[PDB]
């Protein structure tokens, strides 16, 4: 849709003089405006999906940490010591990338 | 991280204004013409593929004798300090190995024993003492509270080594200091060169005059002037030498290069037939392959060291049609030189043609 | 994370330097579009007949003295078919510019029906005149809408006749696609289609006031098209200030300016008077 | 030409185009983004703080597995809040970018229309087309992710 809009804009820019004189400044601007609206209604989905990607990349590690720590409580008998918890958080941050 | 890995959007970025309209291609960014000798009187070429002759250990010494006074003092001090330290370590090791450190500790625990019959060096019991003993042997103070006994010959060997090394270092450092004292007037060069060289008219013929002067009070004995033109020339048989140096005579009533330089002087070369600059006109002296070198040589009477001062002029520096204002004007009862008017030039009227053409129709 | 900061900051610097171009563009503005609230709205019947001469036309559309007029006026009478003769001193810059006050009108303008051309909203004024291209200018999309998107009476009444009126394209009436057009191409017959489209646009609006220029070909087929146009466009009294590389404005010249070089002298007139006044320009070619 | 003018403008950021771009989608769509960003980062700090408190408070009393239910509840509620704020921030950033792009393009096209003939004739056509293609692409698909990553 961007290429279509660019072709229309070049067509309304190259032949500019007759357009300005013939009182057709707005007649060949509305077509580009409509194509631009089409472009945004096509780009909204791209923005949605990229935001979803950012969200997942930021959120999956914290959920993994939550599950891996809550699991120990019920799974195991004894209390958890920092020398393992913090090592494991550093390991998760190493593994994410 | 991975900025533009996706690489689809290209091949249709339209031409910029400077691209299509052709305003960018107006570069006008030519590199300057390569000089042969700089304005600062320093030749600047680039010799390459010279077979390296290695180095010699003599080069370190040659550098050592020629150093700034702010480095001679530092190397002086460092050499002496390092020598004292090295031999201090040797003396401390000798004391350790012979069993003198232990002996002194045991007989100073009950210090009433007071036994020092069998020790390599008396009263050396720690490393501080070894350092002080090495200081007293290298500098030859010799207080005598830490003697050298006749007990262990390794100590005598180290003593001989230390005396000889101290003598070597002392002799070398005195030699360096004396050499730097002998070269005490040898500072720098103070020959002043005019900045622009005019091409005036004098006695009906053109010239090529510049100005040269002194700053040092010491006279210059048997001064000599050489002037050369550097250009690429081709023989009729067609051999091209990229940089040919051709010598141009200097005007002098007895045809000699000897200049007597106390007050500033004007050095003229007259444009005759064989002159390289016979066929150059003022309108040609805008873009031209032309570099004129000037070399003045002599001996400063104080030091008696030969000095050579060079300079070079190109087409931009030459001021066709000017002359030099008189720097010298009499004071109340003594000649005077206003050195602020040294390189100042005045403008006068001279023919615009070349001497190539200025003597084919002389009555002009 | 101590590396992402510098890298992303430099990238953002480059991109902001990119948006700076748009920020620069939005600042500039010119060519004021407004209406001076003319009395009675200057009804369309008034700026649809004849024309009015500009008193002391001193157009300053440059930094140097324009060759078109150096305090030089003109005599544009009702039906004063005009012409242009010369190469540089005579041009269509002032004519086209001041046709609808397009390029820097300074000292007066055309007071048609008592109301000036300048004191009119840009829209109506640009839609109440005409001009010729002197170059084929095509477009994309079907030829149905090119003439006008609301020409319901003429286009319906003349389905293929409106295009045919200036020049009868027979297979346009029965084409592969109903009023289909070849985008940005087909310039050969488009040379005449330019005249046909301009005539249609200015005829449905019933304007008839134009300023032509620089016929590129002037071929025999173009001559027949010109004859048809004269039957249609130049049949009305209001005629254009024709210009061309070859001097063919003297067939029905009435009131023009002889501008061989430097300035323009408003002296062109009927055949004998044109030859006497503009003998140099008519004898150059 | 640098002239110590474009030189300084190269050594430092524009800082005024950036502010205009940031405040182009409105003013309540900006402080929302900063608010959500800061809250999410503070929460992500606080969850680690709480994890440290839980880990250190019961390091010694290994036989005594008491007070093992309050800590887990705190950790889980903090994790939920962090996940929600993460979900919020990306959507806010992309909404701001979308609105800013829309407004910029519409204003550019609505101000290019009222352009004098001297502007079009003097200015080469290639420059205008490059401005639309390059600036539209950069301001639509490139600035939001860069800004989000930087922040
Ligand atoms: C591992 C070990 C670590 C070691 C760490 C570093 C140890 C450093 C310790 C000492 C550091 C000293 C450095 C100080 C630098 C100051 C130099 C200062 O003397 O400059 C003064 C000049 C220096 O001329 P130049 O720049 O070298 O150029 C060379 C020459 N002029 C040229 O242009 O070509 O120099 C001169 O011009 C000559 C100076 C002569 C010195 C004076 C001696 C005095 C004798 C005369 C008797 C006077 C009475 C003195 C009594 C004083 C009372 C205490
Ligand atoms: C750069 C500055 C040089 C300064 C070096 C000396 C450091 C201080 C002296 C010192 O450490 O004392 C020690 C030397 O210990 C050593 O042997 C250090 C030798 C290092 C030499 C450094 C060369 C560079 C003393 O060691 P000791 O001789 O075994 O003492 C005897 C025991 N008693 C004192 C109880 C009798
Ligand atoms: C550069 C180094 C110069 C060093 C010169 C000093 C030599 C010490 C001499 C010495 O004391 O000899 C002694 C041992 O002491 C020894 O062990 C000497 C061993 C020879 C050292 C040669 C090293 C090389 C020998 O002493 P004596 O056996 O009792 O001699 C009695 C015989 N007489 C009385 C005739 C002399
Ligand atoms: C010359 C430069 C000497 C620098 C110092 C080196 C001395 C430290 C090492 C000494 C050593 O090796 O032991 C000595 C024997 O070696 C030796 O006698 C030979 C020394 C070899 C290194 C030179 C014993 O020393 P000792 O036998 O005298 O001690 C007991 C007497 N009761
Ligand atoms: C940064 O990547 C990683 C990060 C993490 C991990 Cl576990 C692996 C990688 C990885 O496998 N990386 C591939 C190697 C790599 C890295 C960085 C970069 S880069 O410097 O960011 N980009 C540029 O250099 N582009 C220039 C300019 C135009 C084209 C020529 C190169 C470029 C290439
Ligand atoms: N009064 C002076 N004292 C020391 N050096 C001088 C003096 N006048 C000229 N020079 C030397 O002349 C060289 C060229 O200087 P510069 O081109 O600035 O001016 P100039 O042609 O010498 O004369 P002026 O300074 O009057 O223009 C410099 O290297 C400078 O050292
Ligand atoms: K003594």
PDB file of C-alpha atoms in Angstrom, chain B residues 32-33 39 51 108 128 130 138 164 190 208 295 328:
ATOM      1  CA  UNK B  32      47.154  21.030  -2.914  1.00  0.00           C
ATOM      2  CA  UNK B  33      50.191  20.844  -5.158  1.00  0.00           C
ATOM      3  CA  UNK B  39      58.097  26.790   3.810  1.00  0.00           C
ATOM      4  CA  UNK B  51      66.825  -1.858   2.546  1.00  0.00           C
ATOM      5  CA  UNK B 108      71.480  -9.685  69.439  1.00  0.00           C
ATOM      6  CA  UNK B 128      68.403  -1.737  55.085  1.00  0.00           C
ATOM      7  CA  UNK B 130      72.783  -3.998  52.819  1.00  0.00           C
ATOM      8  CA  UNK B 138      79.429   2.684  45.175  1.00  0.00           C
ATOM      9  CA  UNK B 164      84.445  -1.501  38.593  1.00  0.00           C
ATOM     10  CA  UNK B 190      67.951  32.393  13.507  1.00  0.00           C
ATOM     11  CA  UNK B 208      63.394  38.038  -8.704  1.00  0.00           C
ATOM     12  CA  UNK B 295      69.846  27.837   0.483  1.00  0.00           C
ATOM     13  CA  UNK B 328      66.765  50.802   7.136  1.00  0.00           C
TER      14      UNK B 328
END
